[PDB]
Structure formats: C-alpha cells, structure tokens
Amino acid sequence: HAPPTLWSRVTKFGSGWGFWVSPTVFITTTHVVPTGVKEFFGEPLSSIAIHQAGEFTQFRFSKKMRPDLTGMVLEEGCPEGTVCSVLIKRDSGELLPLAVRMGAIASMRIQGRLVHGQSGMLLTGANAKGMDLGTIPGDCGAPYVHKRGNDWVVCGVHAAATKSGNTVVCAVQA
Ligand SMILES: *[C@@H](O)[C@@H]1CCC(=O)NCCCCCCn2cc(nn2)C[C@H](NC(=O)OCc2ccccc2)C(=O)N[C@@H](CC2CCCCC2)C(=O)N1
Ligand SMILES: [Cl-]
Ligand SMILES: [Cl-]
C-alpha cells in the first residue's frame, strides 16, 4: 500500500538502485556503487559524507538533493517476523513490491565480502502468482520497507538472494 511519494524515492544508481531517505540522505548497496567517478548525482565527493559497511552505503549530501521529500525513519534492520516490502522498480517505471518475511540480523560472508544483513523468505501468499526469484529482475539496492503504525520505515537495501529456501538478504546499517 506504499504511496507514490514513497516510490518516487527509488532511484536508478550505478548497476542497481538506491533510495532517498530524506532530501539529503541516499542509501544503496555498496557493490552497485560506481567506481572511478568524481561525483554522485552531480555533487563532488568533497561535499558528500559517506558511511558504509557490510554492503550498506549511506550518502549524506551537503544540500537538499530531493527537497520534494519528507525525512523518514531509517532503522538498523527490523524485528524478526516483520513483513517487509522490497520496492523493486523496473526500467519502465513499473512498481513491483515484493513481500518478504524477515528473519535474523547476522554477519555473513557472501561472495567473499562481509555482509551485515538480515535474511528473509519471500512471502508467496502476498505476491502475485509466479512473481518469485525465478522471474523478478536481478538488480540490487532496492529498499526494504515496512509500516510502523501508519508510517513507512526503511530498514535495509537488497543485497543477495538464493533459490535455496527462497531466501533474500538485505544489508542493514550499523
Ligand atoms: C544484486 O547485485 C544481486 C541480487 C540477486 C537477486 O536478487 N537475484 C534475483 C533472484 C535470482 C535467484 C538467486 C540468484 N543467485 C545469486 C547468488 N546465488 N543465487 C550469489 C549470491 N547469493 C548467495 O550467496 O546466497 C547465500 C546466502 C543466503 C542467505 C544468507 C547468506 C548467504 C548473491 O546474491 N550475490 C549477490 C552479489 C554479492 C556481491 C558482493 C557483496 C554481497 C552480494 C548478488 O548477486 N546480488
Ligand atoms: Cl513518502
Ligand atoms: Cl549513477
């Protein structure tokens, strides 16, 4: 039930996607960040505070980059059992929320990189028939969000998946 303003925060970035938490804060998965660049979104590196670890990257810009947005809450993962929506966007702009039942926050090594993440299982009963790991786009960086009361919170960014157990991992901030 995510509103259009929430989806307007999901942005193509590098080899994947990221998400505007607020006018000044953008989050993504580290491995999709472009290298050898002198700017992100036109802003020089000298003007961006970067905080990243365990495949979670946060950029805090020195000016309002998306002044259209309200600041929302970024949490360091979510409680076990939370049903999150992964806000997957297609290149066409089509919106594909993917429901996931979240498990435990843990450190993991994935493809030789330390990941500070939260695992989850796709919630088949809350996704369109046939919309699963074998059919979604394979991009990273999409945000994991859930509702706290009536308000949406963001708690991670898509980092990994495996068909074994229909399992996904989001990286989480520390
Ligand atoms: C983004 O860059 C991708 C997102 C992958 C995705 O979501 N694809 C859509 C589903 C397709 C079916 C899964 C394809 N698949 C990829 C792998 N295995 N199967 C490789 C990595 N998976 C893995 O090792 O899982 C084991 C696991 C499960 C649960 C908890 C811990 C470990 C995988 O996903 N690798 C991602 C890139 C690496 C790059 C270095 C930093 C960590 C992530 C990947 O392909 N992400
Ligand atoms: Cl919003
Ligand atoms: Cl880019």
Ligand SMILES: [Cl-]
């Ligand atoms: Cl890092």
